[PDB]
């Protein structure tokens, strides 16, 4: 038995789609007490086909994004404005927790493979993602608020809020750019 080895099979799939996939590796200290010094880290892998978009969402953890293959467009959203970055194979960048962002595969022939090293701090070993979009897998977190809270907040009738941004639209979190 080799406790330091982690084959591809040990990757729990968070979301598969015909356009791409997002996978999460089991905790390093899952089957062994020999790696307690790695308990705050999780490894994620992201793969998408040409002209695809991963919907805007923010993570509760710090992410170290690394482009393994392909090219990519990363957009980091700030309450003030936004920053756009073009990433090439081998590029890396840090995405601070709480920053909403979306990833695009602009190429038309080459796939995109990205390694995401997460540094957790809110709940050690646990990494969560908050998607603004409603899908089958999960409804927009904005919908968990009461009708009164939403109406007052956005200052608009509910059924209008519902059909404009709460209603289940996309099939998955990974869609294709028109």
């Amino acid at each position: 038995n080799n406790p330091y080895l982690f084959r591809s099979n040990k990757f729990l799939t968070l979301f598969k789609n015909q356009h791409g996939s997002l996978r999460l590796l089991q905790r390093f200290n899952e089957d062994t007490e020999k790696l307690e010094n790695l308990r705050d880290y999780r490894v994620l892998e992201y793969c998408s086909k040409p002209n695809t978009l991963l919907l805007p969402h923010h993570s509760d953890s710090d992410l170290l994004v690394l482009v393994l293959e392909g090219q990519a467009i990363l957009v980091l959203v700030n309450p003030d404005g936004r920053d756009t970055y073009k990433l090439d194979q081998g590029d890396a960048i840090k995405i601070q927790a709480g920053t909403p962002f979306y990833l695009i595969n602009p190429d038309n022939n080459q796939n995109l493979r990205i390694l995401k090293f997460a540094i957790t701090f809110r709940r050690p070993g646990t990494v969560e993602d908050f998607f603004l979009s409603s899908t089958k897998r999960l409804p927009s977190y904005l919908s968990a608020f009461s009708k009164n809270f939403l109406e007052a907040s956005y200052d608009s009738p509910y059924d209008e809020i519902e059909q404009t941004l709460l209603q289940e639209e996309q099939e998955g979190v990974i869609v294709k750019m028109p």
Binding site: F121, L142, S146, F149, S153
Partner: protein, 76 residues
């Protein structure tokens, strides 16, 4: 180190509905040692503090005066 007041600086958010005072570890030496942030929240009855979230800080809110209806959204 001397005492410092929560409302010693201008509020970071001021309305007709409410005010939010905040002192961060960046602006106060005593606080940066503890990596703590402190804030005072004052709202008029009926006022709503719109949906938002803090990127890094976990906040322990304390009801000092009045009653508050809070709605927290989480992902378990």
């Amino acid at each position: 180190d001397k005492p410092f007041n929560l409302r010693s600086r201008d509020p970071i958010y001021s309305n007709n509905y409410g005010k939010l005072y905040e002192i961060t570890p960046e602006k106060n030496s005593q606080l940066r040692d503890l990596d703590i942030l402190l804030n005072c929240l004052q709202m008029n009855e009926g006022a709503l503090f719109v949906p938002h979230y803090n990127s890094r800080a976990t906040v322990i809110l304390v009801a000092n005066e009045g009653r508050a209806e809070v709605e927290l959204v989480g992902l378990e």
